[PDB]
Chain length 366, copies 3
């Protein structure tokens, strides 16, 4: 009878799509920057104009680390013998030799500079990104109406990055882990994008303040495989506090990945830049604690390809079907991966059950 | 000519039998307790009545760690979504869903609660323990006549647990490592149990006190593969000081194992509970130093399936033949494993040789 | 077009030849000494006379670590059961048993005691060293005219020891890494020995003093695969300061190796033993910083069997052809490995290019 767990070996291959490697301001200071990603090391530097360039970190001459080098003009100087390489990956200048060989070309990585952020496009097939596959421009970033990012990062070891994407369908953990109250849950999976819609409230059995029915309306969408944006809103004190929360990650290796996230808020009327920036901080700091709680779950949990779902669980398999799209060749993608699938959880019993617990635990004091 | 060493790969498989995972008082406090054993993780919790239950640590729903959970009633609540699992391994209650699937069953581990201790039965074939395979009840544990355990543990990395069992036939190390004087040595190997009989004394070249011929009579028996009990006695100050020393271990993985041991003493007449407990402590503290010295031997030694024995060495091969019984299927056990084999070392020359050294080293001072 | 890197798996096999395991004074104190080398552990002890002996560290009886033992007479006493083994590897005496088996023989390692140093000969084929394969005696070590070694060591992890030998042909790194000025460079590769000849000067853009054209004449030769000696000379203050710098290494495993080096100076006329020894120290301390800078290069670099060389690069492939000699059977060596190959780099443009940089960087201050 006993149901056993199925742990298939984690994928050696890495996902095809845009992966966010952090803010432009962090890469716009002239220096190069090493990054261990996709089972190797990349170097990211910024030419005189400002354009950020990305190549393989290992120099083709003697294997030197180009990220330990120095930027000179619009080329990267290797710390070993100061060979110069440009954005496109062609050796421009050898300082002690007359001229360079034409076959001196290294792999340049296709980049996109948007939303105050840097994206790289990994694709083991090696082809450039299509037209319809990209990253949305956020309503109005850059202008004074929205604050700058309260951006933060964690480095996770000992597990695969599949199970951060699994959170898209896990309504129940928001209660028992993050200490919120889901009242609504719907998911939509279109070709290469995966969505979560959620209306959630706080729970009364917590110490300081929020309204008795302080409610938040979330709307999160992976523009897959690794990059999510979340539009958030709560109508309190008359007007609505809009917030945009970014969740994005990238793999280092199959066993390890980096996790990035940040938040900006629209400037409410009658509020300064600092008060606005403080709201963004508090929100990100609150998410910080959230993902810290996930990490302890993720760190101690075992991988499992055969879940046993109840009737209140979201569509795990259809999420992991859609997510399989990115680890396979584009030519081998099937309809069942990119199809339109939608599903809403009947939370009526779930919330009724959670009301018993929240009230029961209030009576215990004082 | 040169004799070479034979290091065959350590067994992936784990031994079949009762393994002691420590004292009942350490698991009787309501909380769950994680334990990494047998190439995986188990969770051990105690229901309301007191009965200790053991299952696989990884939850069948989403792989959550049940040892990071909480006990509610007579079920274990998963820290991920608070699913409830009972002693037998059936899901009893999902708090946010109406009812549970009948196919929600996880692997329960067969347990035995005895001698103030908890044993689990691992057996890769998956069958329950027979009738004649078990653990002896100690003469009279529980009553006031015997003290509670001075119980202690070490965690050993970088070697297999075979070579703690090898100590059963190694008379010579007691001298050069543990600093005792063996006068007698006999071994008996019956079906699934392995015995050592030893009469040993102290050596005069040690600093403080013991009698000039202070003698100890040991009688140790593995009720194999992992669990040993040792009856000890010394007749001093008129009456006999009886002691019972437990040696027991369990594997974490092929490359790592935990080592547990403890001692109780019979209350001598005219002696309080505290003085009695102090004798148990001193003895265990003296063994502590002993096994610490073994660890340095075990840590720096290499594994070796082809020893080169002298004429004063105990039966290594016949010990490792008997010990092979537990890593093979019960159906593939042969007579040579379970046979009656007995052997006594003629120590006459050995002790004569050690008398030269002990006396020689007294003359060096002062 | 893009040129890709070729990282073939590092050799499991270890090089055939003399490897220097350090100074005789460090092994001449009676105690044994463990050493992890050649994918295993060796023990090195010194008999009563003084002769250093080397065997496998793991005792053939029960695998005990002989390096954790004690020397008694001209035999090594095992810390487990004090079995005694002599220089040739025969068990001499079991202290608690009457006599020893004749088949008790362990592997002794062929040694050479010279230049205040100890060499071992590894050779996976197991044959002794020929006549013409050895280590030169240094002009006049031992006498008062030359000081004792300022000897030093580093332990390098995460890379193969091939690429310290690669430095033999890398003129360019001396400039950009070590901050010197190469004016001359020639290499010679005879059967089993590899040579570098270099005339180098300091560069004027450095803070404190040296002459405006303070020049050094280097002459380094690997008596391969692992052992190099370097004769150095600079004619300053009328007479010539001769120096002899040793570079030598040995592998621990394919992924890790130890790096040793030291320097002695000829006593100039009118100079004491201490002033002389201080010159040796300063030189070794200056090399220290040098190899420390290499380690950061070696630590961050990737292995690469397909370099892309310019017209000012030394003969990498012909160095690695000659170096392949030692990882193959002696019977499978070809002419192209042991042939006479010589090559000199036309440095005229290289030095002209480096003069622009050194002068340009002087103008920047103050
Ligand atoms: C108390 C005020 C405060 O500072 N609160 C902290 C921000 S609210 C919070 O951290 C949690 C209750 C929830 C609320 C929104 C949740 C995110 C929804 C989008 C999302 C979809 C996923 O699939 C996975 C994660 C997120 C990013 C959710 C994380 C938890 C959040 C922020
Ligand atoms: C000085 C008074 C004192 O506190 N002595 C410490 C206890 S005596 C001691 O540690 C050692 C000298 C010896 C004496 C009995 C030995 C055990 C016999 C049973 C045994 C069989 C084995 O195969 C392996 C280990 C043991 C548990 C022996 C360990 C060493 C002991 C305790
Ligand atoms: C400033 C005075 C002083 O203390 N100088 C430090 C000694 S000079 C030094 O460290 C470097 C500039 C150079 C000079 C000689 C170079 C060695 C030549 C032989 C050699 C051949 C190789 O293939 C690899 C390394 C060496 C040992 C060279 C290391 C760098 C040296 C010492
Ligand atoms: S390693 Fe990049 S310059 Fe040679
Ligand atoms: S992981 Fe145990 S409740 Fe889902
Ligand atoms: S291990 Fe060397 S004496 Fe037994
Ligand atoms: Fe979460
Ligand atoms: Fe022992
Ligand atoms: Fe160097």
């Amino acid at each position: 009878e006993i149901r056993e767990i199925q742990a298939a070996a984690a994928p050696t291959r890495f996902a095809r799509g845009w992966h966010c490697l952090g803010l432009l301001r962090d890469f716009q200071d002239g220096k190069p920057h090493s990054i261990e990603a996709f089972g190797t090391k990349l170097v990211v530097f910024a030419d005189s104009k400002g354009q950020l360039n990305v190549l393989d970190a290992y120099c083709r001459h003697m294997g030197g680390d180009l990220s330990r080098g120095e930027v000179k003009g619009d080329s990267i100087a290797c710390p070993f013998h100061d060979w110069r390489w440009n954005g496109k990956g062609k050796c421009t200048d050898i300082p002690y030799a007359r001229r360079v060989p034409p076959i001196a070309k290294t792999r340049a990585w296709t980049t996109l500079e948007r939303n105050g952020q840097l994206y790289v496009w990994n694709d083991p097939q090696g082809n450039p990104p299509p037209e319809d596959v990209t990253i949305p421009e956020i309503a109005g970033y850059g202008t004074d109406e929205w604050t700058d990012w309260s951006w933060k990062s964690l480095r996770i070891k000992g597990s695969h990055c599949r199970e951060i994407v699994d959170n898209v369908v896990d309504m129940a953990h928001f209660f028992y882990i993050h200490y919120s109250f889901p009242r609504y849950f719907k998911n939509v999976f279109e070709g290469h994008t995966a969505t979560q819609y959620m209306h959630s409230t706080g729970r009364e059995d917590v110490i300081s303040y929020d309204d008795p029915n302080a409610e938040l309306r979330s709307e999160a969408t992976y523009f897959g495989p690794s990059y999510m944006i979340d539009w958030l809103e709560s109508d309190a004190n008359g007007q609505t506090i809009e917030t945009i929360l970014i969740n994005c990650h990238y793999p280092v290796s199959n066993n390890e990945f980096v996790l990035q996230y940040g938040a900006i808020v629209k400037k409410l009327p009658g509020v300064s830049d600092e008060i606005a920036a403080g709201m963004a901080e508090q929100f990100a700091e609150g998410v910080q604690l959230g993902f810290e709680q996930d990490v302890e779950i993720w760190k101690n949990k075992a991988p499992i390809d055969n879940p046993l779902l109840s009737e209140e669980d979201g569509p795990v398999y259809q999420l992991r079907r859609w997510y399989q799209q990115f680890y396979v060749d584009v030519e081998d993608i099937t309809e069942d991966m990119t199809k339109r699938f939608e599903f809403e959880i009947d939370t009526t019993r779930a919330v009724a059950s959670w009301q018993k617990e929240v009230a029961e635990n209030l009576a215990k004091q004082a």
